[model samples]
Target: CIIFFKFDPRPVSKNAYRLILAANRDEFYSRPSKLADFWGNNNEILSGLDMEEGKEGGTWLGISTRGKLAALTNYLQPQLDWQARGRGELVTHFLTTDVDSLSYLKKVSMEGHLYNGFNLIAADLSTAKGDVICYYGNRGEPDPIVLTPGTYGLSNALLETPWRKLCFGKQLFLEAVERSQALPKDVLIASLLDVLNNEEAQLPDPAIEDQGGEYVQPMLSKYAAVCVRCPGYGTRTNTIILVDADGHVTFTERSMMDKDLSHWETRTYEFTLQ
Candidate 1:
């Protein structure tokens, strides 16, 4: 149920791009990343960890060596007790190694038979090898997912179910992405965060009802209740990271509880390639 929505735009450099790294967990726990850890060497790699020994860790969205990318979102199937099988192990294993997206997904499809259900979207960005592939999988056969230059949505339930309203939000980033081509690193990161954090950028739900009757007055609420529980506001944490061609990385993390207008606290880190 955590980190329900995320978007990672393609990098302009052809070598550099944006990534949305997230982990969704039920309870709170912390596990720090160390040198030669399962994941990358960057400190930000393990920032939102909710790792516990026997409990279900959450879903993780991350990139890999050779420019391969993958993200996982879990479906809440109350009828099944999937946690009996390892959840965190699946996600952590994918991100911590040098496996290709398609091959890794196939392996998960076979091995996932013992665990609960999950959906994984993986993409390969290695142009040098002339191989670009994207796949989505449930417990069954994996299917390729097509992506374009603009924005796309992926959530726990379905790819765009929770993000139907925010499809237009992609337009806001067009200018920023174009400008980032010439801007400084800090400025580029700030620009990207500005677009990512725009309070106006949101997805709307269809289940809401506003009834107005002569006998019964309709609710005068200005904001939709569904908006309050969206991933951007509720269970999800928004993280943005930019990696340059030289393998330099800049990252920022912010949660739903972060105050809206006056004050905002963002954790930033910069490090060279490992």
Candidate 2:
């Protein structure tokens, strides 16, 4: 049993060429998943597999050798968490197919509601224009929009919904990125690892409400921080990817064998533009 977790424009967004993504997967321990492995003929598929419900092989995030990346996060509403289709398939489908983000979003969006609420981010860096990232969601918008260069956050809610965890984590990411410019890789990785491992904020407390006793809502701490550790569920994997201006990619994944975050095995690879 597992459960969940938009775009905007700015002229300054063009600076987004330096791509770095750091996130942790919060899921139930019951689900079985194989580490990121090559699938398909000639190993064209580079992604993690979901051993559960086989047909819909799962992948919270993945990349293709064709210079594209896809990532997905479930939108948790408890009431509508169950999906008629697997949301993980959305990302895998994007990676496997030849459709561009714009075309795919325009087409798949029509049947978006068939699956549960989700945020699917797809990017293509093969072009000379550098990396192009787009966002699509059933809960947020009917169509997709291009993203600019800025630190944004996503949880189980709408994109950049100002959730406590999202806001705090966005700041952490920005600070981490800014903390090291002169020395890029080492500083950036150190900062991201800090966010992924540290618990600067507390989990959800059901007893309380927002200020002024308003906006009473359920305590969903599963979306807290880069890494989360709630009662029955916690973060199972932490993945960070970096792509430089020249299309050089650095992908590192840290996965836990058990709940305590013990026996974490790190997998990393670097590749040139395909």
Candidate 3:
């Protein structure tokens, strides 16, 4: 499972950002993946790729030059078949399409059962009226939620499930956004990345324990941490994305270069909407 929190739909102030997000992607260390970049053949999509067998080219998060945003996180269930559609495809599909967020999600919700449980957030930031962000969890919400202008969090369970990490991460994210007002660009990004680097385990996260079920009992404590660090599996990457009122996009990603956490690199890309 992965974790993310974001401030969306823009703030009231014109100079403030329209959206700010920080997230960590947790997975096995051996899985092959590519760092974030613009897709080949002039696709104009910037995102990391899931290079695992049978899941090649899918992404956990991405933004398009056309002003589209999409991200996904897995929702663990008691019994799930591994043969289902790859959840990463949902994120990629939205980025490549021209459909508005709500309409696209409405269509996806109808076929949600075909894939494993997942939480998907999609937004149309290029709109003339304003940015529209929609959240839909196949297992939790009966209908897609059209979000209001505010900060929110989502983890493996359901949307805004109040899991320990989500609550704590949301707070840290908010503080960083406030601090960004006075910090330099590099410092702001470092602060955002620090939130995803949390290693202290948060115990007694009953929601994780309960929702995780028996398969997760042994790692109940590790799963509660904002950053899960283990030998076999752990947080693989950290990503930060910000879009300001003037329509500038700043995207950054930090990915581990090796299994031992010995080396890693951070990449940043900036652009304005088309």
- Total clashes for model 2: 3
Model 2 accuracy (lDDT, Cα): 0.67
Model 2 C-alpha lDDT per residue in residues 101-219, reported as the tens digit of each score? 87777776898879877887887766465567788889888989877765667666666766566666777776777676336575666677677765654456332233213322422
Q: Quick one: best TM-score, which candidate?
A: 3
Off by more than 4 A, model 3: 1-5, 8-10
Best by lDDT: 3
Of the candidates numbered 2 and 3, which has the greater lDDT value? 3
Alpha-carbon lDDT, every model: 0.46, 0.67, 0.83
**After best superposition, candidate 2 residue 137: deviation in angstroms?**
0.8
Q: Candidate 3 residues 16-134, lDDT tens each? A: 77877888998888899999999944668999999999899999999998899888988866677878898989999898878999998999999998999999999888635689999
lDDT, candidate 2, residue 102?
77
lDDT score for residue 273 of model 1 = 39
Q: How many residue pairs clash in each candidate?
A: 1, 3, 0
Off by over 4 Å in 1: 1-47, 56-59, 63-69, 76-86, 112-117, 123-133, 139-141, 144-150, 160-162, 173-175, 179-181, 198-204, 207-236, 255-265, 272-274
lDDT-wise, the better of 1 and 3 is 3
Task: Write out the backbone clash pairs for model 1.
Answer: 11-17
